[PDB]
Amino acid sequence: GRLRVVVLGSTGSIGTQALQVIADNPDRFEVVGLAAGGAHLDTLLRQRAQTGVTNIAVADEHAAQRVGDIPYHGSDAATRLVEQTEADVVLNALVGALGLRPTLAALKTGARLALANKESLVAGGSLVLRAARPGQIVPVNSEHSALAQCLRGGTPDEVAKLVLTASGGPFRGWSAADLEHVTPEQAGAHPTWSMGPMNTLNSASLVNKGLQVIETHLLFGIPYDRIDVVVHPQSIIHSMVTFIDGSTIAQASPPDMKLPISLALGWPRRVSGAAAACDFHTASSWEFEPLDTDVFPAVELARQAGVAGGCMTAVYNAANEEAAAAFLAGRIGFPAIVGIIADVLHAADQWAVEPATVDDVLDAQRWARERAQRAVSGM
Amino acid sequence: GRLRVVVLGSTGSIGTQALQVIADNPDRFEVVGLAAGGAHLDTLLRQRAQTGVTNIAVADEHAAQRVGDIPYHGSDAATRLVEQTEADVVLNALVGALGLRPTLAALKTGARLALANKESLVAGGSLVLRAARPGQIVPVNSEHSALAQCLRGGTPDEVAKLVLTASGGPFRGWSAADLEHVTPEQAGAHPTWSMGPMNTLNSASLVNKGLQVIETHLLFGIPYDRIDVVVHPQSIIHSMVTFIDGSTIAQASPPDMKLPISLALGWPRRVSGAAAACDFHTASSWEFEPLDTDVFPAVELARQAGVAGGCMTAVYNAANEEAAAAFLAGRIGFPAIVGIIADVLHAADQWAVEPATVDDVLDAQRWARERAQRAVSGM
Ligand SMILES: NC(=O)C1=CN([C@@H]2O[C@H](COP(=O)(O)OP(=O)(O)OC[C@H]3O[C@@H](n4cnc5c(N)ncnc54)[C@H](OP(=O)(O)O)[C@@H]3O)[C@@H](O)[C@H]2O)C=CC1
Ligand SMILES: NC(=O)C1=CN([C@@H]2O[C@H](COP(=O)(O)OP(=O)(O)OC[C@H]3O[C@@H](n4cnc5c(N)ncnc54)[C@H](OP(=O)(O)O)[C@@H]3O)[C@@H](O)[C@H]2O)C=CC1
Ligand SMILES: O=CN(O)CCCP(=O)(O)O
C-alpha cells in the first residue's frame, strides 16, 4: 500500500526533492531511513525533525559524534542502514562510486532501487546487473525516466534507436581553442538544471552524457551503436525512442527533477500533481543540433569504454573523478579532463575482465585513480 | 500471421497508399476485397488485374455497366462486400456519408475497422460508438494515430490532456482584417489530382481541426475541455498526451501517411520500414504557438457542437460543407464560412437528440445544408 522509502544522500539536491515528493504524497510514500555525508548537519537535523525518522546514517565520524546518538556512522554506515532497514524502495542519491556498496546491499534486499547514483551502475557493471531482478533498478534521472516511458510506445523487438538528449552545457558551440580558458566558475553554472557540483561539471564536459550512455546500455540492454545523443538546449524533451516503422516517441516536461523522482518511487504508477506540464498556451520552440564530437569526445570515449566492458566503465568513471577534482582545484585546464580520461582508458588493457566481486571493481578504480594522477603530474 | 484486408475507397489517396503498404509487406497483409465509387473505375480494374482480387464492389451502376463481371454493384455494393467477405481488417477510406453504412456493417462482422472515413464518427457518432466494441476502431488520421501511440505512456486514468497539433494552415498568424481578403486560390484551391479542394480549405479554416477534436472525443473518451489544440508549423509532432504527473508524451515523424496507415493496418504491431524516422544529424526546431481562437473560432464551435451531442456534430459538418463550397463558388467571403456554421448551429438544438438510425443522421445533414443555404442566399 504505502511504500516505505530509504533515502540515501537525503541532504543533496535529489534527496531534498525526493523528501518533498514524499511529504506531498503521504498516501503513497513514507520515509523510513536517511543517509548523509555529515557536511550539512543543519539540513539533516531539519530533515530528522520534519520526517520523524531517527534511523539515520552519517558517513563522517566527527560529524555523527557532533550530532549524538546517530545509529549508523562511519564509511559503511549507508550500507548497514540499507541492510538493516525494512523497505520497499531504496532511493540511492549518493554521489560517486562510493554509492556502489549501498546499491548492492539494496538489490540484495529485494527492494526497488530508485537509482540517482549513476556511478554505482557505471562502475559496478555486470556485478550490479547480476544482483538485480528484472525491473528492480528504476532510474531517477530525467533522461532514463524519459526512455522508460517512451519504450512503452512499442515492444522490445520494435525498438530501432534510443535517443538521449543533452543540454550541450554552458560551452555548447565553443571551439577547442575557446575551451582552453574555461574556469571552475564558468563551468559551475548550468543553463537549465540545478544540480550538485559534480553533476554540474560533468554536464559541461559532456562526461555526464557519456556516463548516461553507459547506464542506458546497462539498464535497457541496447547496443552502443543504437544509442544516439542529440543536443537539445531547452532541456524540455528529455529523451526519445525511434521505432522500426519510423515513429519516434518523446517525453517532454519543463525541467523539474520531482517528476522523474516521483515516477521512480512509485513505478509503474504516476504521481498526480508531481510537476508542472508543458504549457502550450504560450509560444515555445524545441531545438535540436548535432553534438560536435571533435570538440566534445567524452561520449565517444564512453562508448569505447562501454564496448570494452568488464571493469573499463569503472575506469572511465574513476579517471573522470580524479581529473575533475584536479580541474576544480585549479591544477589542470578544462580540456585536460577528457584528455586524461582518454590517456587512462588507452592504458587500461587489463581491465576488460568482468568483475566477480566488489574487490575487482575497487581494484580497477584504484588503478585508474593512480593512472589519472600520473597523467596530471605530467602536465 | 497474415491479416486479410478489405480496402474500401481503394482508388483514393489513403486506399492507394494502403495498397502500397500491403504490396510491400506480403508477409503481414493480404487484400481480399476492393471497393470504389466508379469515377475511377479504370484504376479499380487495374487493381483487380494487378492484385488478382476479383472480390470487388462498384457503387455507380453506370460505371458497373461498363464491365459485366463485378460481383457487387449499385447502392450499398461496399456494404454487401463487407457483409459477405471474411476479413481481419476493413479499411474504410470511403468519403462522405456513404462511408457510414459500411462502417456499421464492418463493426457487425467483428473485424478490426481501420477508420479513415470522417463522417462515420463526426456524423454517425453514437450510432457508431454503440456498435463498436473496445479497441475495434483504429484511426488512420496522423493526429489520432499519434494520440493512440502516446496513450501507451500510461493507463486511461492517468490522462490529463490530449493535445492535437495543427499546421495552422496558409493563414497562420493572419489578423481578422487579413482574412477578409482571402481568395479560393489562396485557400490552397488548385485542380490538384490527389486532393479534394475542401481538405485544403478545411485546413485553412481550422474546421479540419474542429472535426479532429470531435473524432478525438469519440475515439478516446476524453471530455472536450481536456482536448487542446496547439499550432505547430513543422507538422513533425503529430499530437501529444499530457499525463496527471506533468509528463507529456509526443509522437514525432517527418510527414508521411504510410506511417499511420501501416500502424492502423497492423495494429497493435508496427510495420518495419513503413516511413523514414526523424533524423537528428542536421539542426532543426519544433515550434509551438497558440491559436487565436478569436480569429479562428472553428475549434471552439466544434467543442460546442460536440458537448451538445446527438446529431449536433453532423450539423456542424454539414453546415461547413455547404458554407465552404459557397466560399469556393464566390458566394461568400472566407470569414463567413465559420460565421455560417455558428448561425446554423445556434438554430439547431432540435438535433441534440441521439440518432436511432442512419436516416436520423441523414435528416440532420439535410436540415443543416438547407439552413446554411438560406444563410448564404439571404432567404
Ligand atoms: N542533481 C541532479 O539533478 C541529478 C543527479 N544525478 C545523480 O544523482 C546523484 C546525486 O545527485 P546530487 O543530489 O545532485 O549530488 P549532491 O552533491 O547535491 O548530494 C550528494 C549527497 O550525498 C551525500 N554524501 C556525500 N558523500 C557521502 C559519503 N561519503 N557518504 C554518504 N553520503 C555522502 C551528501 O551529504 P552531505 O553533502 O550533507 O555530506 C549529499 O546528501 C549523482 O550520482 C548524480 O550523478 C543524476 C542526474 C541529475
Ligand atoms: N487524404 C488524406 O491524407 C486524409 C484523409 N482523411 C479522410 O480519409 C478519407 C479518405 O481519404 P482519401 O483516400 O484521400 O479520399 P479520396 O477522395 O482521395 O478517395 C475516396 C474513395 O471513396 C470512393 N467512393 C466514392 N463514393 C463511393 C461510394 N458511393 N461507394 C463506394 N466508394 C466510393 C472513391 O472511388 P472513386 O474514386 O471511383 O470515386 C475513392 O476510392 C477522406 O474522407 C478524408 O476525409 C483524413 C485525413 C487526411
Ligand atoms: O535529469 C536531469 N539531468 O540528468 C540533466 C543532465 C544534463 P546534461 O543533459 O547537460 O548532461
Swiss-Prot record, chains A, B:
Keywords: Isoprene biosynthesis, Manganese, Metal-binding, NADP, Oxidoreductase. Mn(2+) binds at residues 141, 143, 212. The keyword Methyltransferase does not apply. It is an enzyme of class 1 (oxidoreductase). SUPFAM superfamilies: 1-deoxy-D-xylulose-5-phosphate reductoisomerase, C-terminal domain, Glyceraldehyde-3-phosphate dehydrogenase-like, C-terminal domain, NAD(P)-binding Rossmann-fold domains. It comes from the Bacteria. NADPH binds at residues 11-14, 37, 117, 119, 196. It catalyses: 2-C-methyl-D-erythritol 4-phosphate + NADP(+) = 1-deoxy-D-xylulose 5-phosphate + NADPH + H(+). It holds the Pfam family DXP_reductoisom. Its EC number is 1.1.1.267. Its cofactor is Mg(2+); Mn(2+). InterPro entries: DXP_reductoisomerase, DXP_reductoisomerase_C, DXP_reductoisomerase_N, DXPR_C, DXPR_C_sf, NAD(P)-bd_dom_sf. 1-deoxy-D-xylulose 5-phosphate binds at residues 118, 142-143, 167, 190, 203, 208-209, 212. Pathway: Isoprenoid biosynthesis; isopentenyl diphosphate biosynthesis via DXP pathway; isopentenyl diphosphate from 1-deoxy-D-xylulose 5-phosphate: step 1/6. GO terms for biological process: isopentenyl diphosphate biosynthetic process, methylerythritol 4-phosphate pathway involved in terpenoid biosynthetic process; terpenoid biosynthetic process, mevalonate-independent. The keyword Ligase does not apply. One of its GO terms (molecular function) is manganese ion binding. Catalyzes the NADPH-dependent rearrangement and reduction of 1-deoxy-D-xylulose-5-phosphate (DXP) to 2-C-methyl-D-erythritol 4-phosphate (MEP). Belongs to the DXR family. HAMAP family: DXP_reductoisom. This is 1-deoxy-D-xylulose 5-phosphate reductoisomerase. The gene is dxr.
